[PDB]
């Protein structure tokens, strides 16, 4: 019984670490005075002005380019 608990806790910890890494990679800091532009490569550069604001950029799609 103990070994199963060990393995399950390890799997949960690994999943939590992966999720935390993804969440951290999904955020950006475009300092103010720099209004950001979403660097979305799905459907492009957002006429919807996503300026300053750490909007949740999905990884592999939206890299924060900092526009001053």
């Amino acid at each position: 019984m103990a070994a199963k608990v060990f393995e399950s806790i390890g799997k949960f910890g690994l999943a939590l670490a992966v999720a935390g890494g993804v969440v951290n990679s999904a955020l950006y800091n475009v300092d103010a005075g720099h209004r950001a532009v979403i660097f979305d490569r799905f459907r492009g550069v957002q006429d919807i002005v996503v300026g300053e604001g750490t909007h949740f950029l999905i990884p592999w799609v939206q890299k924060p380019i900092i526009f001053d």
């Binding site: 060990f6 300092d31 103010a32 005075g33 209004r35 300026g51 300053e52 604001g53 750490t54």
Partner: protein, 75 residues
């Protein structure tokens, strides 16, 4: 390196029920203290470190004269 951490975590003695909840509460308190410490920002006077509102950009109306103003972390 991961297996070493595996063995180190495993080797923690299987103590009675109390210390498990004690460790959980200690971790809670540690995280809370870290958050409280981080909610304040690098602050030099001669620098009106204003609130950068996450939404709408800079706070054009929130003009921080000399004064506490806690930055919401990641915000």
């Amino acid at each position: 390196m991961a297996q070493n951490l595996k063995d180190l975590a495993g080797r923690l003695p299987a103590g009675p029920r109390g210390m498990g909840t004690a460790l959980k509460l200690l971790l809670g308190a540690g995280a809370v203290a870290y958050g409280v410490r981080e909610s304040v920002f690098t602050v030099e006077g001669g620098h009106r470190a204003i609130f950068f509102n996450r939404i709408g950009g800079v706070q054009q109306d929130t003009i921080l004269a000399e004064g506490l103003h806690f930055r919401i972390p990641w915000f």
